[PDB]
Structure 1
């Protein structure tokens, strides 16, 4: 899974990989050659009292070490570049995938959890970094060191092998619980982050009710739990570090003891013993360094696994059934047939809805709060799929239509309006892009928005903050209408789009609505019944079920729920 993903990123880049591998051979060879300095020092130069040869040999070994450092520098640069490319690919893929998940995923999870999942990729960046990724390369290169040590002294070789076996045993034994603890601490920190975002969002309410002390007391338990998980995870490192330190240091003492015994037995002389001890830094220290990074590597593995959970979720388009290519325009009659829907496993929201919106007409959806009108709009726009029944457009199931066409021919003006940080030109031309300014200004004029935008500085270029508060509530709601009309939708849905506008702007928008292009279906969802008295048909929702349908004239003519609503409200 993730292993295949990493391999795929490495397929295009081979020259760097070949150079990285080949440069490591020179580095290890130079280090091995430079190890013998102490042997040459304690067998010939010191014993025979040679001075000039001492200087020459020292200069040569210093030169060798300089070349070794230069090779290490080159390899480090290449490794850093490779790791950066891989990290960029990983982050880009994760974001591109998370932006295409179904809506129920966003409903189920919280913002903080998704944020924490994303930014945990920084842990992966640390592991793939050049300084770390060098260490494993040395571990693969330790085979040459092992062969050389076996060639030097066979008896001493079966003393470092045992050390590596002990290292591996410790590594597995602490590999399991360390992974468990890192997963636990990541989950706990994700829980902490989510409650912090909620605290920031509702800062106004918290301040108004004086609940700062209560909120910080609530955050204690999450901070305390994070500290407990860290401390429990802390001792797993100390135990690992101490057990490794037992093997590493005591292994050196044992090796020195065995070498002294061999020298006393007249086997290899002291110089070869010192050479063996020094050369051991290219067979054990690379392994010892790698084991010391197991805490950091385990963190990256858990972070990647957590990212893997999201990437395994099927996208919105993947779930969709094969799309019929014979449909290009959503022109016709929108029909609901026994549609039932429930937000998860709770009580049903819509119960046996049967609708028939005539082609190129304006219809109305009215009802009390929480009666499923916005849910009907979302179902028509296919954010959620109906549990039972189907939605037909011109006699064709909405399931058998490409998702892009549905989301491009249908415009939504939600109950709220979301404004992205950028110029007003960018916000108006969201998604469409590459559109003539003549079209944008025409849409803004059509929505009675060209005036207030003209007064503010920079015209269609002023900067807007995240959910720009410098724009009034009515101003933002005018942008959404202009944005919807900008795409020339085939079906227009207005969800409380006339709630914060004066009579003049409402009349202007109505006049624009009655004459966009003709034969365009317009669905208006509103609570003020007075504004909706001049439409073709009106549907009344009563707790997820239509009760009476028709125009305004006959709906008041027959006495019922609509008549009571009209009389009470006016």
Structure 2
């Protein structure tokens, strides 16, 4: 509707906010955003408020009319037909109150949602209006996430507050008036009940604080686990080859052991909160009626069950809703104050030729130096200015100065004509790549195609699946970097400005593309235009009309889940006996809950059947027992669900983690790191932190719904006939709703993230989108994405309302059946029985909707459990240890034999080694040579049995097939292709099994000459390394990987580019260290820098299929028909000459030796 779409709805609130800034400027006070919101929406809040007034009035009137119905039975006489008519009157009024609440909820459930959405959508408008106009200072001291958190979090508070806000008055007023009504019904004993009620307020508030401390304290372990698990999952191939699986197992078990201790202790406090909500009514009624009878009053059914029904009214609003409102209105005011701050944040000022004179600027006046100083320049049509200089020269400060984003500190800047800007970091928005080029301009195909061909972009637009109609993600994720760079320039070239600002786009592309862009676009296409080009591509500079060189900031030069999933989730947590015990204690909790209320009905009947008086010792004694058993079972049941379900979450994580460790590497190839880690971060998260609560809350309420129906059918058995249709309706109604709702619920979620992602993209682009003065267009696109989500959300609202307005209709019917049916059968039953029937009947709505709501949340969250259960059942590597284990001296020589070996990364996959058959002699030096991925990397995966080979691999006449994987993998030393360090001690990275001497460690750390860094690091070998050891250089990480091999003594060493991350001199020196440290080893080297292997005793040359050469490299080089000679000949003449000279000399010496 036009009255609810974002532009109209937001523009009015902004009008009030500015007027609250015009006021408090015509006045010395500061502004209030709360005044602006209130002054805008008070007309809606009032009607939201009147519903609460009328609703809470009827909820209090229901108990009083219930008293009139029961009063029919307390003095029943079948001869008074008029009394029967009058009871039907109140039975009518009690029905009307019931359907009134249904309609009030049906209206209120609409207007609260619409009022909340309107306030949210108006706030979204003002926040995004600012984001297009933030100062570039503010965009420094604030971040993309911190602004998006406004939309993604702080604004979502407002439509929660609009629900609860009026309970901040309705709660207190109801507690007062219900206290007054209880006083008229009971007398002073009503205070003893309310004393408990106002104590559960602080007591539940305290448990919330104590829980929040444990919930805060446990998050440190969770992040430590998840970060450890992330490096475990990321590094898995290196973790596997080192056999360090037992090390990271013992880390994760200790992290998980400590974490679940906190999750259990926090969960028990949270079980105590829900136990309080369950027992609260029973304690409140117990202390009330105990004190009432001790004052000598006698229990009669009307007074009791009116009073019990009144506590049922005030309890829920005072204990649940009033604290929820005070909490969420606190969240409101922190959000309002945060949004007030952001809306007041610094803005961009309200700012053919370019002319700049005496120009100086500071990004921060607190800087020790200017960020630009004493610049001056001017440039005019047909001129190209090239801007040149080192890193930190100020080049990007100049262009952002000319664009006017960096204001001048001194001097002056002026421009005439349109300015184009292309940013070095390319930027793209959710839309067609064509839209990413047209940027809202009219589409003209010829200038467009000229742009495409001038940008040499036609191929990429022909390769995209839907062509240039391919939707690009809000960060360009479906383009390559070089496409989005060229797309980002193509935009500016279509916009055809008078002045171009180019911030080094020519570095985002190859020299050929760069010269194609520079020559064709910049020189030829922009030939008539002003250009200012910053670039590191100095190669063209003589083409520039003028050159400005900068340094240090100044100028230098100019020139649904199945039952089995539920069964496994419960059975995995505890023995079969405890789950039976869990069911019994759940039923025992609810049966005892009912039975004390039945006991008042029995006590009422007995008092009515009677001077003489009841023996209080019996009735009050049993009443104390039944109340106490509800407390005991209510507590025990709460703690035991949490124990069984958190214990299940402990067991299932451990089975899943052992499975993930034992998964074959192929599992981490076919599933990405994020999707695996999401099992541990989200799904185990729910299984720890939400699903146990939701199960307990569902179970607690569901048994209580069965309690209402059970009491009613136990007291009036003929109600079972009206209920079987009512059940049949409900089952069909739920089935129909869940079939249709799941789609609209998804649609309402999938349409929200475009709002945040459009903002998040719009923030990254702010420089360029404001450059074209595209603000107001990019505001309408937000209003389109916002008001399109509003449309999706409105369809969800009507769908949910259609269910709710009849889910509470079947509940309203149930009250009619009990209310009127009780009178139709009035001859059969006594007043206390009818009081028990109806006081339970009156509580059905509210909790019945909540029971069904919690059913949907359980059934949804169980998807997380099914998603972990699939990972308990992964395929496994062969056992770490077989029955046979090699003698500890093996390998004694390190002879490796390949025999007819084939390998494939999957048993369903193509072969990537075939018939590989070769002998490697002990102490022999072998180089592995061939095309990228042509067998080379598969050989390492085969030798370590990362995927099982076909054919036979022997080590010292042991078949590697017939021994445990840790026998094989431990007894071979590997220096990986990409080095990895793990977050922990330097010692844990050198010797996690703690089996090398500290003298040996230091000797290795000396032998790699890393000790200087370990002496520079404060903790020596015990120093805590950074994230992945980022404190060390990638070269130093290779030094650590060399040390590990030095420590791990083995006959067999495998090497893969192990030194390529090092400068050529230190690279070749640590190559010499390898020769010095492993001269005795059998060494297999995989490399591309043939200079690293030319001195091998043999080189294996692999086709992608087969071992084509395997011989002395000199003999291979003398075999000019070898691929080895062809390869060195392809490298070049001097390369082959150098290599062949080295080979000849070493071959002669090794033959002479």
TM-score (norm: length of structure 2): 0.40
Of 862, 873, 897, which residue of structure 2 is paired with 1:312? 873
Report matched runs for 1:46-65 at 5 Å. none
Worse-superposed segment, 343-352 or 299-308: 343-352
Q: Which runs of 5+ in 1 are unaligned?
A: 200-205, 212-219
Query: What residue number does 1:350 align with?
Result: 913
Q: Which whole-Å CA distance do the structure 1 matches of 2:1106 and 2:793 have between them?
A: 52
Structure exhibiting the larger radius of gyration computed from Cα positions:
2
Q: Which whole-Å CA distance do the structure 2 matches of 1:509 and 1:447 have between them?
A: 11
| Aligned CA distance change for structure 1 residues 322 and 428 (closer, same or farther; 3 Å) | closer
Of 955, 961, 976, which residue of structure 2 is paired with 1:393? 955
- The answer as to 2:1043 corresponding to 1:482 is yes
Deviations 1:491-515 (A, max 9, x none): 2101011223454664455455455
Query: What residue number does 1:369 align with?
Result: 932
Worse-superposed segment, 448-457 or 67-76: 67-76
SS in structure 1 of the partner of residue 1022 of structure 2: coil
- The answer as to 2:1039 corresponding to 1:450 is no
Query: What residue number does 2:361 align with?
Result: none
Q: Which runs of 5+ in 2 are unaligned?
A: 1-563, 770-781, 1139-1153
- The answer as to 2:571 corresponding to 1:10 is no
| Aligned CA distance change for structure 1 residues 126 and 278 (closer, same or farther; 3 Å) | farther
The Cα shift of 1:115 comes to 2.2
Q: Which whole-Å CA distance do the structure 2 matches of 1:343 and 1:412 have between them?
A: 20
User: Does the CA-based 8 Å contact 1:35-1:279 persist in structure 2?
Assistant: no
Query: What residue number does 2:825 align with?
Result: 262
Deviations 1:307-338 (A, max 9, x none): 222222212236x9976446663444322233
- The answer as to 2:990 corresponding to 1:428 is yes
Of 784, 804, 815, which residue of structure 2 is paired with 1:252? 815
Report matched runs for 1:6-405 at 5 Å. 6-11=570-575, 14=578, 18=581, 21-22=584-585, 25=588, 28-35=591-598, 37=600, 68-69=630-631, 71-118=633-680, 119-125=682-688, 128-130=691-693, 132-133=695-696, 135-136=698-699, 149-160=712-723, 162-171=725-734, 241-263=804-826, 266-268=827-829, 271-280=832-841, 290-317=851-878, 324-325=884-885, 329-330=890-891, 331-343=893-905, 348-386=911-949, 388-405=950-967
User: Does the CA-based 8 Å contact 2:975-2:1054 persist in structure 1?
Assistant: yes
Q: How many residues align?
A: 535
Q: Which whole-Å CA distance do the structure 1 matches of 2:989 and 2:789 have between them?
A: 40
| Aligned CA distance change for structure 1 residues 230 and 559 (closer, same or farther; 3 Å) | farther
The Cα shift of 1:303 comes to 1.7
The Cα shift of 1:77 comes to 3.1
The Cα shift of 1:343 comes to 4.6
Query: What residue number does 2:6 align with?
Result: none
| Aligned CA distance change for structure 1 residues 525 and 135 (closer, same or farther; 3 Å) | closer
The Cα shift of 1:357 comes to 0.9
| Aligned CA distance change for structure 1 residues 505 and 129 (closer, same or farther; 3 Å) | same
Q: Which whole-Å CA distance do the structure 1 matches of 2:574 and 2:989 have between them?
A: 39
Query: What residue number does 1:551 align with?
Result: 1112
Of 417, 424, 437, which residue of structure 1 is paired with 2:998? 437
Worse-superposed segment, 371-380 or 167-176: 167-176
User: Does the CA-based 8 Å contact 2:601-2:836 persist in structure 1?
Assistant: yes
The Cα shift of 1:550 comes to 1.6
Kindly indicate whether structure 1 or structure 2 has the higher relative contact order, using CA contacts under 8 Å at least 6 residues apart. 1
User: Does the CA-based 8 Å contact 2:574-2:647 persist in structure 1?
Assistant: no
| Aligned CA distance change for structure 1 residues 256 and 348 (closer, same or farther; 3 Å) | same
Of 520, 523, 536, which residue of structure 1 is paired with 2:1097? 536
User: Does the CA-based 8 Å contact 2:694-2:857 persist in structure 1?
Assistant: no
Q: Which whole-Å CA distance do the structure 1 matches of 2:654 and 2:794 have between them?
A: 34
SS in structure 2 of the partner of residue 107 of structure 1: helix
